[PDB]
Design a protein around this ligand. Structure first.
Ligand SMILES: Nc1ncnc2c1ncn2[C@@H]1O[C@H](COP(=O)(O)OP(=O)(O)NP(=O)(O)O)[C@@H](O)[C@H]1O
Ligand SMILES: Nc1ncnc2c1ncn2[C@@H]1O[C@H](COP(=O)(O)OP(=O)(O)NP(=O)(O)O)[C@@H](O)[C@H]1O
Ligand SMILES: Nc1ncnc2c1ncn2[C@@H]1O[C@H](COP(=O)(O)OP(=O)(O)NP(=O)(O)O)[C@@H](O)[C@H]1O
Ligand SMILES: [Mg+2]
Ligand SMILES: [Mg+2]
Ligand SMILES: [Mg+2]
Lengths: 482, 470, 484
């Protein structure tokens, strides 16, 4: 026969070389006598080069291989919300079959030059530092980057946890569905990340595509595209998702494994030439689509893991030059106790201004200014300083303190803008630096009881009246006096 | 008897190619045997090269092998004896005894390669395992059921540390324990076996609480590359079938990756970066993910991790981090100060340090201790250049307190008496937190630096303070 | 009959590919018709791959090759004592046939977990810095590492010379036979060395094994293994040998050469994949046997040469983690007058005090930590801001302690010469004496102690442990002398 079927010539190291299968398409999924699946990546004169999805102990020389006539696809659609799948769309959580609105290929063209609009709606993360200083827009691609154990996942997870504000509501255009792509993580970690969103009732609007430490490299290579196509479902259907890739470092490592084994030629650090093209394809798929396209959107939070802080490292270079900016983490800031451990000086969002709750952007155009000058007079923290550069150190410490934020407790916008107001306009300079802790708690609960109306206007109008500015001012001066 | 025969067709170092009759090949990961003048020689099928030929890896030395020599298919992966019969015994990579106490009389053997538990078999618990070691229990506390790595470049105190753990944990532990020696010093192993007997943990004429699995660096890559799974399987069996608590000690898990490294090219794989094998990530994944608490029972593992060239960003250790619940980072800089254990108080982390698990006070003390030392670290520029003179008064005190704290984090291990001549002191977790709390609020600012160094609890700080002032 | 013979297919660069030799063992020895011997390392399907022990001008295509039927192996036994042999254990001195008690193989399993003991005997080097700071034990492996021309060989040598103290005696169990392996050294340099051994009547208890610069890569790679066996004889037979591998960096250079030419694909810096396994299996062969097995020890001093002080390069890293500690020698230290240029900061013996003499231990209490604190205060001294009575205090002592450990080449000291020196320094009797004069203190002190309080010196020696009264006599004795 040999047009629909083949014979394994040899097998090892997750790769099997197969004779025939002559009608096979590049990247066609195939199936082996034993039942393990694999995909065909190299189509060579005499043989096909298939990568395995399972242990190659299952495969032997001479075995029969069957075409499935199928480019890797995945079930997509909302029947997936609250589910934990592997990279092929399979259910890994004991909850029965996925109800798929349809199927999409793992590989898909990015929305072109034409069917996009400029990013203009906020992704509100709840994190004071991020929302105020590194504003993320819908459709944007903000990159989370830092060394191991700095807090990268925490930033993403708080974005996810903060969507209850809208996802529990009615208004579609205002909800945001979460997609967490776990790559080469300890299953017990994933398990616990699940057990964490369910503890915050976030699962109901999240999807976990799981490609854990121990699974075949192809699955780890595929998972992000697989999940990409899951996101686009929402994008294409006038809705909004956001997608967290945790992490791209490990995806690149996976791609590497496949290539080297297929004996594709290596470059810098033994990555194939098209490792860039790998990640460009992925992240270019994220966008804000134009009115004609249902105006849906897909936002991207790729995670990238530096090594001893090396942004020049091969992979971080590629990815940094694809994204619209970075949220930058540092263990130094972390052990100082500044959590989130966001390096402000190094974090940018190329989208920026355009994506900020106008109200937060109103009381914070000054914030990047102050914290800039505070970074420059910082070493003066060691006896005879003039009142100007004394003052600069007075704001900075308080301001930095104000942007610490315990985990899992993201703040509502109408809850951020008061604190950032009292800060920037100098109502904390009087207060000591240790009390800035209890300040926030007591201010907000007081504002809730005695000024719930101003808070309501911010939450509703999204902007600040000349009156609202005197309202807040008065309510602050009252609380600061008290 | 229905035996399958092949013949050796090549030997290149640790790689032995074997040829079999028509489509009748043993599958990948199967064991083969060659009956040699002294004992047998186990092989492990690695690839199917084609034309009825397989590439194997040798669980021993390949010298003396003759091409065309009969090979025998065992029909399945390398087997180990399992269960309570391995208690008090020493085992080599191929489930054979090396204690010369006769054959390991168990009812079951088990393949050393096995699948890692499904996502749905996982068990998350934030339970805390008290070590007795001040810095761990304060700053990066080890999790029962957890995985726990000990990172360290050569000779910063990993093996000593891990033995201090065994000294403490492995008594108070009701269940069983496996120790795996993966490519370490035959003599270290020697000590352990003689300590186990004298700690009582082993008893060659009665009940024993621990199994010993050895594959030291005196042994060829294939062997050094599988003996982890040999050990790990014995653990697995107590986890899943004795339905109970295990403690899995691996020293040193980096040699599993290294051994993988040493044959990679001979199996014909292009090198990846820093000349590590292309399969580093997934190979480590494929092992580490079996070492795991599940619904049937709990493992708790302590793995020493060699950090090559003291470089933490070396592909090998850098990969291992993702696998552990708690990371204890030993540092040369620390150890060079005479501060044992060489734990880096800032770079050490454990998921359990969260108020929800240890209480707020514990978390606050632990955070402040960290802030203290972080400041003291930040100021070491201004101390060098402009002395201690040119400092804010709060700072002068922060430094005073940081130095006192650095020392209170050291502690005489029992195991390391040969080095300090100082008796081993063990500290209770509540005593740790209380004393650091006290130190932190200044209720000890008068006592000299030396009084905190190489002592147990705050009792010992006072005791020493006076004994020296005398 | 192609079972026991092969014809040569191609020959070049120490390698011969060979059709036949069907019954041949991996790692078996073969004679070529021309005379030159070789070793089979790549038994491939069509052919066999052979590294030669000789030159190859003498091997031609088609020339018949022959099975020995043996794996590479050496003569052993105390007959080797005094002899200079090549990698295969052939006399190269000129003194005629080796008499052997038997033959070991070059590769031998290291003694297991089972038949060993704790290292508890000192291997006294007579090097003040070493015997107080990084004390070496009968059975332990101890790396000597540093750059080129730093004094690596010198440390090893001064150790050997010292054993005279015990080898000219009759107590077999206090004796330490030395094996010195010359790997990649030039011949004259091995000469220059055996001369010095003889100038010191040190050759009667040594065995040099030479794989010089010009010899075949295979012999270089092999030497340490063959040597390990020569001294394994001693360990197995109730005695204690000392093996100096000078030096592994070259063995690996050569082992790299076999492999690249046998065409095995390369590892990092073109080394083979298991260049670690190479050394690990050798160095594990050093051990201290249990009573059941005769209590014999074998002790290893490998040497390793770095470049530009980099210890983070491949091979040093490998061996650094294989051994029970290192002695780092440094060029900077050297040129400013610390010789041995030991780096206390970085040198360790992981056995530690277990292998120190009790007396030395007693008066060396804390020295190594203190010497660290000393570098500490001396780094803070660079601020050139005024010192207090505490820092000036430890500076004065550290400077004098530093100076007290300096030592001339070829002069190993008895323990009882070392002990009072250390005691004088530690308890601060040296602290009011000019730094340039500490030189003269040392010999002038020892001269007086021999002359007068010889009864102490002989107790320290005989007893190895300073009893409380002996501390007294010594205390008195030192004070006495410091007042001139
Ligand atoms: N804002 C915060 N406040 C307090 N603790 C935090 C905060 N953010 C993170 N953490 C803690 O700090 C640790 C590091 O956070 P984490 O999300 O694991 O960063 P990461 O980059 O994902 N580390 P990893 O990916 O596992 O190498 C976790 O153990 C958290 O418990
Ligand atoms: N204690 C010492 N005092 C004076 N000179 C010494 C001492 N130890 C070694 N040297 C000298 O320094 C020179 C080189 O020493 P050496 O013992 O060969 O070190 P090395 O690391 O073996 N050099 P090499 O192996 O040839 O790269 C010799 O000429 C010695 O005389
Ligand atoms: N608690 C301690 N007290 C005093 N000395 C210690 C302690 N821990 C380690 N050391 C010293 O450091 C040396 C090395 O200890 P060890 O535990 O063998 O280091 P290591 O990192 O395990 N070596 P390796 O297994 O090759 O990485 C010992 O010989 C001790 O002198
Ligand atoms: Mg993470
Ligand atoms: Mg160790
Ligand atoms: Mg030399």
């Amino acid at each position: 026969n040999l047009n629909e079927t083949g014979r394994v010539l040899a097998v090892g190291d997750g790769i099997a070389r197969v004779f025939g299968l002559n009608n096979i398409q590049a990247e066609e999924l195939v199936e082996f006598s034993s039942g393990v699946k694999g995909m065909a990546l190299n189509l060579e004169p005499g043989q096909v080069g298939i990568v395995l999805f399972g242990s190659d102990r299952l495969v032997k020389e001479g075995e029969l291989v069957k075409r499935t006539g199928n480019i890797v696809d995945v079930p997509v659609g909302p029947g997936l919300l609250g589910r934990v799948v592997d990279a092929l769309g399979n259910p890994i959580d004991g909850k029965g079959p996925i109800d798929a609105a349809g199927r999409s290929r793992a590989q898909v063209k990015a929305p072109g030059i034409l069917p996009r609009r400029s990013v203009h709606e906020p992704v509100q993360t709840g994190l004071k530092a991020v929302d105020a200083l590194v504003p993320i827009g819908r459709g944007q691609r903000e990159l989370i980057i830092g060394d191991r154990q700095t807090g990268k996942t925490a930033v993403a997870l708080d974005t996810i946890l903060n969507q209850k504000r809208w996802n529990n509501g009615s208004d579609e255009s205002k909800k945001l569905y979460c997609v967490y792509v776990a790559v080469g993580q300890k299953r017990s970690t994933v398990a616990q990340l699940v057990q964490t969103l369910e503890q915050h009732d976030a699962m109901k609007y999240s999807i976990i595509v799981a490609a854990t430490a121990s699974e075949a490299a192809p699955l780890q290579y595929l998972a992000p595209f697989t999940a990409a196509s899951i996101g686009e479902w929402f994008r294409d259907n006038g809705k909004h998702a956001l997608i967290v890739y945790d992490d791209l470092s490990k995806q690149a490592v996976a791609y590497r494994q496949l290539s080297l084994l297929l004996r594709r030629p290596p470059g810098r650090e033994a990555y194939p030439g098209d490792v860039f093209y790998l990640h460009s394809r992925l992240l270019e798929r994220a966008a804000k689509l134009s009115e004609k396209e249902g105006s849906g959107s897909l936002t991207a939070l790729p995670v990238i893991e530096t090594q001893g802080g090396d942004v020049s490292a091969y992979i971080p270079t590629n990815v940094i030059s694809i994204t619209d900016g970075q949220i930058f983490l540092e263990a130094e800031l972390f052990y100082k106790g500044i959590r989130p451990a966001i390096n402000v000086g190094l974090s940018v969002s190329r989208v920026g201004s355009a994506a900020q709750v106008k109200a937060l952007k109103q009381v914070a155009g000054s914030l990047k200014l102050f914290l800039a000058q505070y970074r420059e007079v910082a070493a003066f923290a060691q006896s005879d300083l003039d009142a100007s550069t004394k003052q600069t150190l007075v704001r900075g410490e308080r301001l930095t303190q104000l942007l610490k934020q315990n985990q899992y407790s993201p703040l509502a916008t109408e809850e951020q803008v008061p604190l950032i107001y009292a800060g920037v306009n100098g109502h904390l300079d009087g207060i000591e630096l240790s009390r800035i802790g209890e300040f926030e708690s007591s201010f907000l609960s007081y504002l809730k009881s005695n000024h719930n109306e101003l808070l309501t206007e911010i939450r509703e109008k999204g902007e600040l009246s000349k009156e609202l500015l005197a309202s807040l001012k008065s309510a602050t001066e009252s609380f600061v006096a008290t | 008897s229905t035996p399958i025969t092949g013949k050796v067709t090549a030997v290149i170092g640790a790689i032995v190619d074997v040829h079999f009759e028509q489509s009748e090949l043993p599958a990948i990961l199967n064991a083969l045997e060659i009956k040699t003048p002294q004992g047998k020689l186990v092989l492990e099928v690695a690839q199917h090269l084609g034309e009825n030929t397989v590439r194997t890896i040798a669980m021993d030395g390949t010298e003396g092998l003759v091409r065309g020599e009969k090979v025998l298919d065992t029909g399945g992966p390398i087997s180990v004896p399992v269960g309570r019969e391995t208690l008090g015994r020493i085992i080599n990579v191929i489930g054979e005894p090396i204690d010369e106490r006769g054959p390991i009389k168990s009812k079951l053997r088990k393949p050393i390669h096995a699948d890692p538990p499904s996502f749905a078999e996982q068990s998350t618990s934030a339970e805390i395992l008290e070590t007795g070691i001040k810095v761990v229990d304060l700053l990066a506390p080890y999790a029962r059921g957890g995985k726990i790595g000990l990172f360290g470049g050569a000779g910063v105190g990993k093996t000593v540390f891990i033995q201090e753990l065994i000294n403490n944990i492995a008594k108070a532990h009701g269940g069983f324990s496996v120790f795996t020696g993966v490519g370490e010093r035959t003599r270290e192993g020697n000590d352990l076996y003689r300590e186990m007997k004298e700690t009582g943990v082993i008893n060659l004429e009665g009940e024993s609480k621990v199994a010993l699995v050895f594959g030291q660096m005196n042994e060829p890559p294939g062997a050094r590359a599988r003996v982890a799974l040999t050990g790990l399987t014995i653990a697995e069996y107590f986890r899943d079938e004795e339905g109970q608590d295990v403690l899995l000690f691996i020293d040193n898990i980096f040699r599993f990756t290294q051994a993988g490294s040493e044959v990679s090219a001979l199996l014909g794989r292009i090198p990846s970066a820093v000349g590590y094998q292309p399969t580093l990530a997934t190979d480590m994944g494929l092992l580490q993910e079996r070492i795991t608490t599940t619904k049937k029972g709990s493992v708790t593992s302590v793995q020493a991790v060699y950090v090559p060239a003291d470089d933490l960003t070396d592909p090998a250790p850098a990969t291992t981090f993702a696998h552990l619940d708690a990371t204890t980072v030993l540092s040369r800089g620390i150890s060079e100060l005479g501060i044992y254990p060489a734990v880096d108080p800032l770079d050490s982390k454990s998921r359990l340090l969260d108020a929800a698990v240890v209480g707020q006070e514990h978390y606050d003390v632990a955070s402040k201790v960290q802030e203290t030392l972080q400041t003291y670290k930040s100021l070491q520029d201004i101390i060098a250049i402009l002395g201690m003179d040119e400092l804010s008064e709060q700072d002068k005190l922060t430094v005073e307190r940081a130095r006192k704290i650095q020392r209170f984090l050291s502690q005489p291990f029992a195991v390391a008496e040969v080095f300090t001549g100082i008796p081993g002191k063990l500290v209770r977790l509540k005593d740790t937190v209380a004393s650091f709390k006290a130190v932190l609020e200044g209720k000890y600012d008068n006592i000299p630096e030396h009084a905190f160094y190489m002592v147990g609890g705050i009792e010992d700080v006072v005791a020493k303070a006076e004994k020296l002032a005398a």
